[model samples]
Target: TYDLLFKLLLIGDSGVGKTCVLFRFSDDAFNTTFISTIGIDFKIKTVELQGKKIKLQIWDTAGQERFHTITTSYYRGAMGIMLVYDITNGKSFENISKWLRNIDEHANEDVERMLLGNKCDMDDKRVVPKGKGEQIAREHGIRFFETSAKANINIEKAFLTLAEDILRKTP
Candidate 1:
């Protein structure tokens, strides 16, 4: 039914807003209630780019340390990775290295990846500056974006950019 299918993983520290970002991207809805992801979850969205129908099967993983072992398994087949962190939390930003290390160990070496600083709407409370995100992303050789799932900022663009990068690398 689609020309290409991409398996993407959403990974980050607990309460980094991965679910809200996925919900906003796939369903165009956002919820304020913070329910911890038990193990893993998924959402599918189809987009057309460069005359091709691309289906993204995004896997959302629990960010809690308790679920780390379970969620890393989901990284095995990922074609793309969205490394999310809370803009307002310095610890979350600091932990990005650990997540990227996990990706290095589990995901395909050629997998497309992006670094996203979430909760951008909370600029007043942002502890992880955009410069830090950009510098980290650059050091890792990946693209970077500042997104606000609550305000619907760059959520679609982030996914679409990853999809496009995957498409270019795939064929």
Candidate 2:
């Protein structure tokens, strides 16, 4: 396999499990519980898929509103982005568009993205229905998925899908 490096950014409101998704994708692991992300953190991981060597610079951003001042600056040069929201939280899902707008205002429009509705394991508590996520993704021209980082489900496929999409678009 050949080595290729790409930067990926995770954007969303606070407490949507962006860090958890990053960890799960990069390390194939996840913390069983949730905690507040203080600021931006990054992880590096490599995966061999379909005869290609892919390295990911998975970045986690602070969900706090104040951090947007600095976080938006990091958007430039990103090849891929994962926008996460909690399925069990209505407010988080509702604000998904705002986060998407933030990306458009700051990041490159050509950047590939995966729109994720996380916490799918909590089906009983789901506040933002799956169809809504699909609808938003369609409206925005993004790939859509629902994953559960805590349950270690769909996390890898989501990341891999984003990687494949980015690779397909790159020269």
Candidate 3:
């Protein structure tokens, strides 16, 4: 049972591994097959944070441009957002701004945000450097993390950090 609930969103460019990261965070496991979300999907996970049972309703929004409007609708009630990008694909990283724009347009002004550079395990194919992610995060005034859903790096920490932030801000 949870005493508090927070609605979080996962938004990014298509094929950036947003679903993969969500699976690792919520299920503590990773999926090998890749499938693009059509509209929106969600998962709920409860964690004990600071002695409180916190339930996170994570909305995994579709990253396709076609479903952009549908995904933006779910952003209205979001308390936090995980803006993800693929470290191996520079184009995905470059499109971070457009996704950020969606947050600005639809999400609450005070929504907590984090930048995630997914696929960190693919170092050999990485195009976006860590510094670039950090720099963008700084500019957006949000925290950043390099994660690998396959290798399970910083998956829990990212969600926990966001949960803690929301808890702190909660009345």
Candidate 4:
């Protein structure tokens, strides 16, 4: 059913809606329930990009500090990694660099990376400005996005773009 397989990872602070993004992208579903991932969870989806069937094995990593060792080990095999943060959480945004460092230390050097400022629907409660996310992503030379899983905004674009990026880099 698929012409290719690519591995991707979701990394960021806890409660940044990483699971929500994953569900929205892979399942086209959303819910408000809160549950903290323990170690890592993954999903697989076959999507069309550039007229090619690409099967994405997406790892939804736990953002808790205690599980870093487990999550970091999964990074080496990933072709793409998305770093996400909640726009309403200033500390989460501020910790982006720490997550970046983790990727640098564990992931493939050329792993296609994307920065997502999630919870964009919470504009009234937003603390991190869009420009901050943009500039940080620019500094790292990675693509960036603002997403709202509940509103179903930008989830498709973000996942597809990451797949396309991996495909373009593939042999």
Candidate 5:
């Protein structure tokens, strides 16, 4: 079967658990160790979307202060982007505009994108209101979903919805 190779970049602030999301969705593995990603980490997974074989090259970046310094190289040729943030931390969600600005400056224009609020398992401490995320996504015309990597909740749905959105926007 033919495969559509899609490259995706996962970007967000430090401690937002972008790596955890990648591990859960791609490898079905989860670890509690907290180690900062020095530069760039990536994983590739082949899955079926819309009856087509799709391989996703997912790039996970360091959340350290200078993480973005090295992620520029991987932004090119990205089929989609997931801007992730921790719902418990409001600052992460607040930075969506800044992240969008960075994306515009670095990634190609018209790139398919989505806003993912991760760590939904700890909803008790949620600081980023659900409606706010939806508003941000609506304002930017991007898809939005609150997911829980720890609980394996709404993980694949977010990616699939993003794929469908891209297909609709593409020729």
Candidate 6:
């Protein structure tokens, strides 16, 4: 008997910190190594939120196009999604639309989604402004947050927020 069980997915350009976010949120861990994800990583994490147990099983998609096609087959299984982009890398932010297009094509029509601007702790090297991502999130009707897995900023909170959203909308 579980309280809430929902599948989640993470997608974005390579180097946008999808796996890092999973480590940061799922286990409160971080790695300095910058190895790219090979295909897709899966992590099932559950926790108490407002006295309710919420199971957040995340599918972290590899951004490399080679493995990306393989991961697309999984988008339909996700009930919630997080589209991450790097604040220090503008091209990653610019490619958000491409990521969204993939989601729209493969994910469930009613899937809950959020826009995340990762690497916010690296403000000194920031290229994409918060307002830019904010505008896009608003235009798409998705919640947005600037996260930093390295610095442990907004990592878990964003997950919980999306989980709550999915829970609320679930019938």
TM, every model: 0.98, 0.94, 0.98, 0.98, 0.92, 0.96
| Model 3 TM-score relative to the real fold | 0.98
Clashes of 5: 0
Q: How displaced is residue 46 in candidate 6, in Å?
A: 0.7
Model 1 TM-score is: 0.98
Write one digit per residue (lDDT tens) for candidate 4, span 57-165. Answer: 9999999999988888899999999999999999999999999998889988888999999999999999999999999999989999999999999999999999988
lDDT of 6 by residue, 120-163 (tens): 99999999989999999989999999999999999888998998
Best by lDDT: 4
**Candidate 6 TM-score, C-alpha based:** 0.96
Candidate 3 per-residue lDDT, tens place, 1-171, comes to 579988999999999999999899878888899888989999999999889999889999888889987887899899999999999999999999988988889999999999999999999998999999999999988999999999999999999999999999897
- Per-residue lDDT of candidate 1, residues 40-122 (tens digit): 99988999999999888999999999988899888889988999999999999999999999988988888888999999999
Q: What is the C-alpha RMSD, rounded to one decimal, of candidate 5?
A: 1.5
Reference-based lDDT, each prediction: 0.93, 0.85, 0.92, 0.93, 0.83, 0.90
Q: Candidate 4 at residue 73, lDDT? A: 87
- Residue-wise C-alpha lDDT for candidate 5, range 70-147, written one tens digit per residue: 887777777789999999998898887888887898888878889999999997898888999999899988888899
* Better model by TM-score: candidate 2 vs candidate 6: 6
Give the better candidate number (1 or 5) by lDDT: 1
Q: Which ten residues in a row have the lowest lDDT in candidate 6?
A: 162-171
Model 4 stretches with alpha carbons more than 4 Å out: none
* Model 3 clash tally, residue pairs: 0
The full ranking of all candidates by lDDT, starting with the best, is 4, 1, 3, 6, 2, 5
Q: Cα-based RMSD of the predictions, in order? A: 0.8, 1.4, 0.8, 0.7, 1.5, 1.1
